[PDB]
Amino acid sequence: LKRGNWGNQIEFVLTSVGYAVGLGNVWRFPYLCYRNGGGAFMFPYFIMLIFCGIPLFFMELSFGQFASQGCLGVWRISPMFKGVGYGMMVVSTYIGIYYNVVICIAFYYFFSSMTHVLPWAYCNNPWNTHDCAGVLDASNHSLQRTSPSEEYWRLYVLKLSDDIGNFGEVRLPLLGCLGVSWLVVFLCLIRGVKSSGKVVYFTATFPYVVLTILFVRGVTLEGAFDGIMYYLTPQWDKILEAKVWGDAASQIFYSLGCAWGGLITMASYNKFHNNCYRDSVIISITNCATSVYAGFVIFSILGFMANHLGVDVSRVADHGPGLAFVAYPEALTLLPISPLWSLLFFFMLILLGLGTQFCLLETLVTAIVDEVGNEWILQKKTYVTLGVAVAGFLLGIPLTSQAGIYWLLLMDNYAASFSLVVISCIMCVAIMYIYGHRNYFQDIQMMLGFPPPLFFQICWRFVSPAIIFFILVFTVIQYQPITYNHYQYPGWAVAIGFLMALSSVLCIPLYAMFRLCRTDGDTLLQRLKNATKPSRDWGPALLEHRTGRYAP
């Protein structure tokens, strides 16, 4: 009742868009599009969005909107797969631990960019080496190809270590930046005025303005003409191979943030009679448009750098933090007034990270609150938020150590790759195959006011589970040990990452022991029949909305 509602649908749309658009749309998508064929890769991309992304997004949004309960509540349909919700928390923990750290790094790149002359531009500093031949050097990759930005990142932002067990003194600037980031998130998420409602306006709109300013500065007369023909070229003969289709499906699934407790949490707070069908296609379209726009803004300046360096664009191209912190800044430093575009870029990165961390902390907080929901624990939601924030800050300290980025990449690659796919597959199977497709269809028709579109039904029953199984199989078949620029992680890392992935994957089958022998456990067929039929509680979480068929 007093859980609160959005009050304005624009608020929900903006918060959801801010969560959907993450840092992946900045570095992961442009390089993937460049590497995976060429400008034709959009055809495997958007088609997947039509058949994989939008249906799953609609499923999650309708699930949350009708359930009117958090990450754990939505699973009151079958009180056996509730552990899936538990898993949806655990992954939401891991990302929430290693997302802020990235923000932390970006935060350290924000204040350091307020100086008159950029610190990662000139090789006259005392942390340089003999291999600092940079472009702005007026006064062994191939021969000495170590740009000053990479040197600054490797030697001053965090002193990289050789092994993984080498843990030196913690990086004090990174500790301070992580503390500032966590404090900002908590102070915004106080719910004293709103559940980050009227503060998600700026954090969800300003990144678009910054991207627009960057685009106008990057498509002016700079020589960045052969910087878009390498991103908008018709390499049609690279759509036959299954690898590009698998990568497109993976990007569609991971970029949209499906099935880790993000969409469900803020879909729960929605009013019941909300056109969630309109509220899913719109957000998916904005996410894809943002990815496309980022594919232009970065690559324009990358082509400018390629022209100024006398090399082709393929020489300068990175997939993750390499593009964010050492490739893009080394190109931004060459503009006539650099520490304004650099400031805008880092501010936009901070805003994009916050747009997702807000939702992650909301998901964890609302799950914890709704699990033990009484008139006591709803009165002190802010205290729970403070406790979870301090726990996240304390747990994230080792990731700002000398070997922080190794563990960051390990957690990114392992802890939230298999578990997401498995969780989504299990939820998709259970929702319309264990509970029933027709019951869910009439349930959706109850809330939307119209039957679901004739295409979404056949996409839910057939196309979406098949695509999820396909991406699972492609992930299983395509696997290589996680490696840095040049480093092979020993067992101390691969085994640990496997254990972290299992700590979320196995969370589902471990719930099967909570169904004790009291629930008619013997005669296994009867026990399976029970503990999965919806109880007297599942349904709309309000009165005057029973509509006869629910609780006469």
Ligand X SMILES: CN1C[C@@H]2[C@H](C1)[C@@H]2CN(Cc1ccc(F)c(Cl)c1)C(=O)c1cn(C)cn1
List residues near ligand X by CB under 6 A. 20, 22-24, 95, 99, 102, 254-255, 257, 320, 356, 408, 412, 416-417
Nearer to ligand X, 475 or 532 (CB): 475
Dist. CA 496–CA 516, nearest whole Å: 32
Q: Give whichever of 49 and 306 is closer to ligand X, judged by the CB atom.
A: 49
Comparing CB distances to ligand X, the nearer of 62 and 255 is: 255
CB of 102 to ligand X, least distance (A): 5
Q: At what angle do helices 464-477 and 242-255 cross, to 10 degrees?
A: 110
- Residue 507: DSSP 8-state: H
Q: Taking each helix axis from N to C terminus, what angle separates 381-395 and 338-371, rounded to the nearest 10 degrees?
A: 120
Kindly report the number of other CB atoms within 10 A of residue 121's CB atom: 23
- Please provide the DSSP assignment of 5-20 as one string: --SSHHHHHHHHHHHH
User: Closer to ligand X at the Cβ: 405 or 444?
Assistant: 405
Q: How far is the CB of 459 from ligand X (least distance, A)?
A: 21
Angle 346-351-354 from CA coordinates, rounded to 5°: 125
Query: What does DSSP assign to residue 432?
Result: I
Longest dimension (CA), the chain: 83
Q: Tokens representing 219?
A: 């498509």
Which residues, in sequence order, are CB contacts of 415 under 8 Å at separation 6+? Answer: 91, 94, 95, 98, 497, 500, 501, 504
Q: Which is nearer to ligand X, 98 or 245 (CB)?
A: 98
Residue number, 230 or 393, with CB nearest to ligand X: 393
Closest CB to ligand X among 12 and 538? Answer: 12
Which residues are 484's β-sheet partners? 487
In angstroms, give the least distance from the CB of 254 to ligand X. 4
Q: Roughly what angle, to the nearest 10 degrees, separates helices 381-395 and 172-188?
A: 160
Choose between 64 and 257: whose C-beta lies nearer to ligand X.
257
Residues 31, 324: Cα–Cα separation, whole Å: 11
Instruction: Find the shortest distance in angstroms from Cβ 60 to ligand X.
Output: 12
Q: Which is nearer to ligand X, 78 or 504 (CB)?
A: 504
Q: How far is the CB of 67 from ligand X (least distance, A)?
A: 21
**What distance in Å separates the CA atoms of residue 511 and residue 81, rounded to the nearest whole number?**
7
User: In angstroms, rounded to a whole number, what is the distance separating the alpha carbons of residues 71 and 87?
Assistant: 10
Q: How far is the CB of 216 from ligand X (least distance, A)?
A: 25
| Residue 347 beta carbon to ligand X: minimum distance, rounded to whole angstroms | 18
What tokens does 374 get?
């009484």
Q: How far is the CB of 446 from ligand X (least distance, A)?
A: 29
CB of 360 to ligand X, least distance (A): 8
Stated length of the chain: 552
